[PDB]
Every structure is written in structure tokens, then in C-alpha cells.
Amino acid sequence: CDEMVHADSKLVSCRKECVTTGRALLPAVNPGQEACLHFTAPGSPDSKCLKIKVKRINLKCKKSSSYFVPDARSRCTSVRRCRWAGDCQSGCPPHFTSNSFSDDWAGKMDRAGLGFSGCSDGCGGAACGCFNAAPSCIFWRKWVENPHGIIWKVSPCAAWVPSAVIELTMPSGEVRTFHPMSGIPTQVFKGVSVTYLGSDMEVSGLTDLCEIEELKSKKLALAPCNQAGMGVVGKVGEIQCSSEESARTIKKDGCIWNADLVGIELRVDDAVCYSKITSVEAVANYSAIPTTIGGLRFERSHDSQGKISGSPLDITAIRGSFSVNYRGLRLSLSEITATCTGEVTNVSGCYSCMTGAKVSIKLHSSKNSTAHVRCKGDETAFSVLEGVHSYTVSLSFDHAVVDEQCQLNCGGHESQVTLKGNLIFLDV
Amino acid sequence: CDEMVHADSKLVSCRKECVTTGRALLPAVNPGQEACLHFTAPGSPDSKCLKIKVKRINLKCKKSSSYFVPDARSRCTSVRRCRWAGDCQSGCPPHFTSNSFSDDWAGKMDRAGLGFSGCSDGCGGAACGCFNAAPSCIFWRKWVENPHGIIWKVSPCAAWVPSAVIELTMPSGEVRTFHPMSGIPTQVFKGVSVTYLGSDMEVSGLTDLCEIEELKSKKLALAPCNQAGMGVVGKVGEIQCSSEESARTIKKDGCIWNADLVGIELRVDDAVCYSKITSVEAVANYSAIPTTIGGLRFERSHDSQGKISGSPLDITAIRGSFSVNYRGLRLSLSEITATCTGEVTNVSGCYSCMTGAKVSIKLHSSKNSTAHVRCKGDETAFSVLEGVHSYTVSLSFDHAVVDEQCQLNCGGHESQVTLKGNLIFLDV
Amino acid sequence: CDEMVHADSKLVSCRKECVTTGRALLPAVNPGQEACLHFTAPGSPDSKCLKIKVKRINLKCKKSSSYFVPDARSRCTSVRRCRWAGDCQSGCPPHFTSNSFSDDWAGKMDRAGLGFSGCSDGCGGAACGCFNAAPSCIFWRKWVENPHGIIWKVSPCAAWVPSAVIELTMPSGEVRTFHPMSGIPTQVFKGVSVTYLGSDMEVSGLTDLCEIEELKSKKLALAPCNQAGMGVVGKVGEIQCSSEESARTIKKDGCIWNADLVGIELRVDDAVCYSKITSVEAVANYSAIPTTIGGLRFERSHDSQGKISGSPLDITAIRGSFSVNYRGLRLSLSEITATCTGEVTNVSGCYSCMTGAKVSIKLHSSKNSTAHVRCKGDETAFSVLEGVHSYTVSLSFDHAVVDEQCQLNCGGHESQVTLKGNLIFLDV
Ligand SMILES: *[C@@H]1O[C@H](CO)[C@@H](O)[C@H](O)[C@H]1NC(C)=O
Numbered sequence A, B, C: 001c002d003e004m005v006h007a008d009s010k011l012v013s014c015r016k017e018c019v020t021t022g023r024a025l026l027p028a029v030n031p032g033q034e035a036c037l038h039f040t041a042p043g044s045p046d047s048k049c050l051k052i053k054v055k056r057i058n059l060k061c062k063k064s065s066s067y068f069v070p071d072a073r074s075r076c077t078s079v080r081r082c083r084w085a086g087d088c089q090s091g092c093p094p095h096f097t098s099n100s101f102s103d104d105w106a107g108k109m110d111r112a113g114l115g116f117s118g119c120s121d122g123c124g125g126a127a128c129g130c131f132n133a134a135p136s137c138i139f140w141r142k143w144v145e146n147p148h149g150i151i152w153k154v155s156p157c158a159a160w161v162p163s164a165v166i167e168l169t170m171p172s173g174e175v176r177t178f179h180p181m182s183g184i185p186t187q188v189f190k191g192v193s194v195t196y197l198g199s200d201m202e203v204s205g206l207t208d209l210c211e212i213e214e215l216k217s218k219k220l221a222l223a224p225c226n227q228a229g230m231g232v233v234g235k236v237g238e239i240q241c242s243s244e245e246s247a248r249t250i251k252k253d254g255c256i257w258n259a260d261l262v263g264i265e266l267r268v269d270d271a272v273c274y275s276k277i278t279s280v281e282a283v284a285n286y287s288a289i290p291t292t293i294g295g296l297r298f299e300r301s302h303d304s305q306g307k308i309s310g311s312p313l314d315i316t317a318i319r320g321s322f323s324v325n326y327r328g329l330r331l332s333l334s335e336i337t338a339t340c341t342g343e344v345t346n347v348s349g350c351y352s353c354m355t356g357a358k359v360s361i362k363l364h365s366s367k368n369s370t371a372h373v374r375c376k377g378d379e380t381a382f383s384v385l386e387g388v389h390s391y392t393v394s395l396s397f398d399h400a401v402v403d404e405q406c407q408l409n410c411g412g413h414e415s416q417v418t419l420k421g422n423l424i425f426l427d428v
């Protein structure tokens, strides 16, 4: 097993009772690493074997206020009336503001729909067909509608919190996998308890991301977005609604937007509509779960405290700590370093991209361990299994043609592998 | 007294002036947790008691450049002059640019204020009241003003750093509360010194936030904003000024903006003003201190290193570490586990929101300790005091009606509590 | 030789054979701090000296998808044709959309460039030079182009990862300097190995930054930007291209933009172009490296991964951890505390700014150590050398005139220093 215990002590704890007790500290346990502790009673040379393993440490999205986003399509129309016809009596009437409708539009329109209307001056003379010679009125409105009724629920991730899953193997052979309470001792067997002291992750300053979920396809995505109530043009949430029903038809009462998302000019007798709306569907496709951002792999979650869980691809970039309290027993450790040799089969993917290149490598390891791969461009560490298995790791490059040598290491035994491949650049 | 010492050692330290010394390691102490260390001399058979407690670990806003924002109101005006009247003598004069003013606007306008002017062509013939038939001139200006003179100071938080407040109890009973220097030993009494080794915090990737302060009400807020010199439309700082005085009237001499924050459409005989300005008063009211963002509660600070200090609601998400060096003394520990039972009195607030629901719980604790509450949807941990006291904890829910059971745990003694209440969804 | 070892233990390590081994834990080592370990054999007076030092811990930009940004300038043109001249036969022809070009534009236009065209009505009657009285047609196009051919490559930093550099001094005096792999033991000499357990940095929630590099000057900057494919107006990346070739002339096949970055006002016979494009050169100039953001100094990197390395100015805000495994040897430590006295020579710079004021201080230290400076306005810590040297440190103030007392400390020896200076406020 692995070298995980880095401190062992005999302590005198009191309440006035006082008992001599043993206490071991495991300060840095990466996921996949395993400690094997043996406890021997005074009378019997037999040892009880306890195994302590960090199965996984998940990053959980700590959400802010959620909102809904419709699949918006731009729309507009316009009608012109002479200076003595219709509502246009001596210019634009004062009541025709941004939420006004004209009876001369004749097109099917949602009176409760989200949009922006207005009155403006048009051509006047008889050369454009008006008895009056002064300029006329052009009643126009630009608005958005949601055909197909596609809706996403957007939840910005205000922060990310580690959630550990530990695996403890009893001397009886029973395996207990659970999310531990930090600082709370877990009684494993007679005289011995295990306490999870907390988690550490070396990745910091993660860019702002949001959980995006389509309400009737249930597909998940993770991408930047606006906070609830914000409408910065160019991001998901520029059009947002406070409920699913409001987003179904984009109603005024529940949705907000920036009216400049639809461009409208005013010609003599028509209007051209220029959609400036950012496609939420295109963002959901590009950022679809599973995805890799900032060296963190984000996938669908196996628990209920968040549908998305994250973890670094470099397995040594996140760690747990343990305290083992044992009384009436003597501690011994099972420790051996690992060895591994490797060959890389293919190197494909993209360079200077968010995902990073994909390096395929087959590797034989003497035991379950952690393999390290270090190039001049990037480094990573991943868990490997005993025997011969193939692995696909993510390494970043900044050039198209890759032909360099990198180092491979398990437990201090260093080897070399050959990366030969070609990478592409993604469009924006 | 809690279980905080996880390693104790006897060392041989030299300077060669070699001395045998003891050193205890406290690697993970949450705020509210407390260690009790007893030291006995080889001669005297009784102990001196030293108590080490992490009172608080505060997150301090590491500010970038600050700026000032006014309570801005959109505004514009326009006048139309025939081609042989007024300054319009030969169409729009080239000198009349974005900072030019017309003496015909007839408004008590601030000629030093931030805004944008311009001249455009209008209706020409006698059909719109001009003897000349060539097209007239429209002198217009869109600008922004600050009635009531309300100003906010905005300081973007480029990063957050932990600031620990530790509390040492001497055998004399004297309590010393101070912010320790990491790595600097603090002499407590004869032969013993304690050293703070640093702080750890698990919440990562916190969204960009800014300290916002009203200048003559002093009320604080924490919300997203532009950096200094940036003017993204839709966030605080779209209009920003380099001094309090320039923001009082929004002077062009010290303020910057995007002129598209105000839309102006030119029609004959008047112009309509489209306000696209984000209400800073609306943002500061919603994000008012105290506020809870991403599992962190931000409140007014008790020190002088910034007016806002943050801390995780789950107190086990932040921790400090100590080293205790003792010479000529034998270390013994006071350690006892806590038990608690509780009942939940009220469950109110919102769901799927930034702050989270509020769970009120009466709890009896056998000692100062940490209580854990784990539900199927969320989990938290909070400090409790000895005896019967009431607490208000924040738990997140994604549905309106809450009627479920959750687990309560102090020191590995688990009981159950029932949550009943109704929650509302926040509007954007 | 500082006090870095906080735990030493004797362990029984097995693989049926077992062996007794010593293991020392160094849980918190700041940059510049050094541990001195001495190993003696039971029957031998020969002592072997081992020095463990953290040279520095660097933050590395974990890059997202890269893109290219040109130095764009606004441009537009316009022509007007009477109702029966040119393409204007029956009003504006429908086949003239945003990507159309009129053959009557005088200046030569890049028909493959990025821009936006359109047809609009204008003055009609003989008062503006047309026989027909119906409104004429105005053919216009607003676009951007890249004179001088200046291009930047932008790489958003999705996250930051620490990268430690340690140096080990052998008993032979040899110094071995390398970036360690976390968890991999480094054999130093017979019976002793050193393992790096990981890095902790207390700075969290760092604002989103991007690496900006001019392709032909190689100058670097670090500033906020748009993600790849995003075009929020007001940030770097509002105009972005997927290749250096597309950015050389701002072609449409590879670049994207928001057409509202160029404003066009169509008047009777001319067109005026309004540029609201954010100057990238101004951002790269202001944010040029080396720069200080959020208490972290970002400088040109000395390694191969990334051109930029970050590190806290407060050296106690980042730390490494070591484990020393030694067999058949007894451990003894060399530990001396430091003393230092100092006086500040000059206090200049800005207040309420991202960089903070710069404080120059001459300081006499008895050894290599860490000096702490505590004011009521700010606190920092920096590495000092043995002897008398001058240091420049960054401390933050919120007022213009500084007249306050501050405290200096090395190894628990506290004195006082008197900062006096004047600071200025930066414009937006
Ligand atoms: C190695 O890992 C595999 C899969 O997790 C497991 O089945 C096997 O028992 C492990 N080997 C050990 C624990 O020796």
C-alpha cells in the first residue's frame, strides 16, 4: 500500500480519568491512494487490518438564485398612417409608449409578450401617398417570441465546495463508502476510530460558471452566464424569466431583457429585423456535460446535492486528511512503492484549447498507484491499476505539430515516453 | 475540550547547544473549536492549563482600484431650426459636436455635465413650418444627471484572503485575543510558545464581487460590478467617476460612460429618450450587508482591514493550524465528546435562492462544540454553546413545500429533527 | 535554519518482513524558509546535514481556448442615389442586405472584410437634388479594419495552479533545485528520502484574468477579457478572430464582432462614424506585466509552462509541506530565531489602488528569515537576508496623507516603524 501515515504519537487524554492513547495523522491523501494500517493486541501476534482510501473528492456548485431562459426569436413589424388618419392625429399620440399596440398591425401578436414599441415620423408628401404634406407616423414594435417552447433553467455557481467520499475497509472485510462529516469520529472497530479532518484543492480562481439545464431534454451544460436579474448583452441570461411559464411564451410580467437585442430601422413602408440574440442552444452544445474547464473535469453527479460534480484531472491537485485514534493497540504500516513502464499509442485533439490534447497511453503498474507525466508544456497525474491497462489523459499544448519526449514516474521510478501527433485549432 | 492535538513529538533542537523539546501539532482547528493542554513539571505533580481557540477566520476583500458611481437619471432634449434661422444657417455646422451646446434648448442644463450632443437634419419644406425648402437642423443632446446627489464608493474585490482571530487562555485565566502572525511564535508562559501556521479554506472559485458603500448613509452592499475604467452595460460602474465631487453632478471632467446607455430617437418637433441605465440603488438594496453568497455570509467588519468580512456558513469549511513548543514539561490533553438533541421550530424564507432558507432550531448541547445537520438536499455545520440555546441556520432547498426529516449530530451522537415550512421563489 | 519540523515519529513499516523507520513532517514551509536536519548513526559520530528549502511557489495560468484580437479602427461610407438611379429603382432593393456592396463607393472596400451594410431612405424632393419627389436610397456600410497590422493573442486563465520549486542541500554541500512531483519520494542519500506533499495558497476568489501577448513585440499583459466566442462590449475580445491571418485584416471568415461597436449617423449627403471600440493597446499598456493584482505579483515566467507566474507579495500566504523518511538514523534539528530592526526611508505611490503604496525600508537581520510589517491599514510579510539591506514592500492605504505607526517583527522580536508619505488617487 501507499505511504500515507506521516505522524504517529502516544497521547494522554483526560476528562478525572486519563488514558494513554495512540493517534496517527494522514495529512495528504490523494484520490485513489490507500493507507493500510495494522493493529496488534498485546496477547495475540495477529493483526487487524484497516484500509483508508479517498475514493473521490467532488466539487459541488453552490448556486445563487436560479432563473429561466427562453429560446428567443426576433420579430418586428411596422405600419404607417398619414397625419389625419388613424391614431396619428397631428403627429405621434402621447399615449403610444414602449408597451403600446396599434390596431393597424393586423399580424398575430401576443399582447402580453415581451417587446418594445414606439411611434416615429415617416415620409410625409404626396410622393409617398398622403393627403397631408407634413411627416406621418410609423407605429412599430420589436419583440421576441419562443417557438418550440424550449426553456433552460440557469443556476449560476457562486462558488465551489469540496465534498469528499471516503472508503474504509474493516478487518472483517466490510467496506464502508460514505461522505464523512469533518471533525466527527467514525467508529470502525474496537478501540479504533477514523476522523476526516478536511479537504484541500490546489486549483484556485476558477472562472465564473453556471449550471444550464433544458427542462424537457434534461441535458446539462456548464458555461458563463448573467447573475439573476442582470442582463449583460452577450451572455446567457440577457433574456431571462422568473418562471417556466413566463419563459414559455416570453411574457412581460415575468421576463426582462435589453431591447437593443433586436435591431430595427424604419424605412418608408417596412422594417428589417436584425437578431442580435446570443444562441443559448449553441452555448449548451459547446459546454455540454461532461466537459473540461481549467483542468477540472465536470460530469453528472451520483449524489443529490447538485447535479454536477467537478474534480481536477491532476489527481494530486486535491487531497484529504485523516486522524486515526486507537487505544490498546500497536500500529504498523504496510508500505511499498510502485513501478510502471508506459507506451503512448496516439496523441490527437486540439492545442491552445479549453479541453487540451488527448494522450492515449497503455501502462503496466505493479499495483494500484498514481502515475506522473511531465512535459515541458504541461504535467498531470492520474490513478493507474495493477496490471496492463490503457489510459487517456489530458495534456495542453500551444503548437500544432507535437514531437517531444516526456517523463513517466511511479513511486520514484522514472521512465520516458514519446509524444508524436498533430493538433488542430478551434474556431470562435 | 475538543480533540485537536493530532501529533506530539520529542525533538532534539540545537543552535551546538542541543536541548530536548516537545512539540504538538494542531493541524485542523475550526472556528469555535478549542484545545486544552495541560503541562506538568518533573517536580510538581499537577498541571498548568493552556487553552487554544480559533475564534474567527475572516475573509478580507483585497481591493483593486476604487471609483464612484452616481444615482444617474437619463435625460435629453432637442430643438429644431429652419435653414435660415438661428445657428442653422447652412445645414448642421461642423463645429457643433458631441460637447457643443445650443442656447435654444431652454433648459437649465449643466454645461459641465456628462453627455453627448449632436446636430442632425430634419423636415424642410413649408409643410413643417419653414419658408426654406431645404432640410432643417435638429440640435439635440442626450445626457445623464444625479438628482439628490447620491453617490456610492465602489471597490472591486480582486481576491479574498483569510484573517484569523485566535484566542489563548492562560493558566491565570487571562484571555488573549489577537490576529496572529503566521510562523511567529507567541510566548504564553514559562517554557511554552504557540505558533499559528496558517489558514485553510475549502470554498473556491468565488464569483466576482465588489464592496459598495453609500457615502452619507454608510450602508454597505456586495454585488458584481465593473472594474475601474471598464464600462460594460448592465453592471454597476457602467457610469463611474474618479472623485466624489465629479460624481455628485456627473461631471464630464471626471466621469466616463457609454453613451448608448441613453437612447434618443429624433422625430419632428421633439425627441424621445430611452433609458437603459441600471439602477445602482436597486442593486445595493438587494445585495445589502449582511448578505449570503455562495455559502459565505458577509457582514460588517469588527476590525480596520476593510468594512466587510466573510466566513463560511458551514464552519468546517475553514480551519487554522497551530504548533505548540514546550520545554521541560510533560503534555497531557483534555478531550471529551459532545452530545446534543434538538427540535426545529420554524422553516421559512426562499428556495432556489442566493441566501437559502432559514431553519430555526432549539438545541441542548453538553458543551461548546460543533453541531452538524445533514438533509437529503443540503448539509451544514455550526457552532453551539453549552446549555439550551436557539440557532438560525441556512439550508438550501429547490422546492416550495418542505416536510422532511434530517439528521443532527454532535461528536458522533446522531439524532433526528423534522423540517416543516413553506418557501417562496425570488423574482429576478 | 528555521523551526519547520512539527512532528517526528518512529514507525514500523512492512511490505512478512518489517523495519523501524523515522518520519518527520514539515507541514507549513513558506518561500525562503529552510529546515536544517542532522542525521547521526547509532555507533558513529558522523553527522549528515540536510537542508530543505522552498525556493518559491509559482501560480500557473490554466488556459482556456485562445483567440486573436486585432487593433481595429472604425470606418464607414455612404452614397445616395435618386429614386430612379443606380440600384435604387423601386426604393431600397431587397437583395441589398448587411453583406452587400455598392459599386458606387469611392474608396476601395475589402469585400472579404468584417462589416455591416444596409440601404436606407433619404431626402426625396428637388430640394436635395433629385427630380423625383419620393425618398431616395442611401447605400452605406460600417466596418473595422486593422492598419499597422497589430495583433494580440488572448488566452483566458480559467484557473490557477501552484507550482513549487524546492532546493535540497546535501551533506556534501551540493544544492539540488527542481520542481517536485507531489507524493513522489526523492532519494537524497543512504537511508533518507524527501517527499513533497503539496502546496497551499490562502488567496482565493481571484478575479478573472487573461494572458494577452502581442505577436511581434512579445510584450505581455494580464487583464480581463471575453471568453473564446463571446463578444461582450467593453472588454478585450469584443472583436476576436480564430487565426492570426484572420486578425491581420479582420476578415469575416474567421472573425466575429458586435456591429454596434461602430455607430453610423446618416445625414442628407454625408455619413459620420462613431467609434465605441475598446482600445486593446490601452489595456495591454495599463495591464502590462509585471503587475500586481489582488495581492499577487505576476511577472514573466522563468519556466516553460506559461509565460506568466504569480506569487503572493505576503509570502506567508503560500506554503508547501514535506515528509522526510529516514532509516537507521537519529534526527536532530538546527533552530535559531531571527532578530531585525528597521527604518522606513520613503513612502510613495497611490492609495485605494490595485498596486498599493510602495514602502522602502532598510533592515538589519541576523539571518535569512521572514519580516512582518503590521499597520492598522494593512499587513504584509517578505523575505529578508542576513545583514543590512533595503527592501520595497507594498501596503494598502485608503487616505491620501499617511501619518501612522507600524510594527516590525522577526522571530517574535517586535519593534516599531514610522511610515510618512503622500499618495495620489488614480483616474478611471
Ligand atoms: C485496485 O483497484 C481495484 C479497483 O478499484 C480494486 O478492485 C482492487 O482491489 C485494488 N487492489 C488492491 C486494493 O490491492
Ligand SMILES: *[C@@H]1O[C@H](CO)[C@@H](O)[C@H](O)[C@H]1NC(C)=O
Pocket (backbone or CB within 6 Å): B368, B385, B386
Ligand atoms: C463556551 O463558549 C463561551 C463563549 O464562546 C465561553 O464564554 C465559555 O467560557 C465557553 N465554555 C468553556 C470554554 O468551557
Ligand SMILES: *[C@@H]1O[C@H](CO)[C@@H](O)[C@H](O)[C@H]1NC(C)=O
Pocket (backbone or CB within 6 Å): C368, C385, C386
Ligand atoms: C541566505 O540566502 C541567500 C540567498 O537566498 C543564500 O545565498 C545564503 O546561502 C543563505 N544563507 C544561509 C543558507 O545560511
Ligand SMILES: [Cl-]
Pocket (backbone or CB within 6 Å): A203, A204, A205, A206, B203, B204, B205, B206, C203, C204, C205, C206
Ligand atoms: Cl479560489
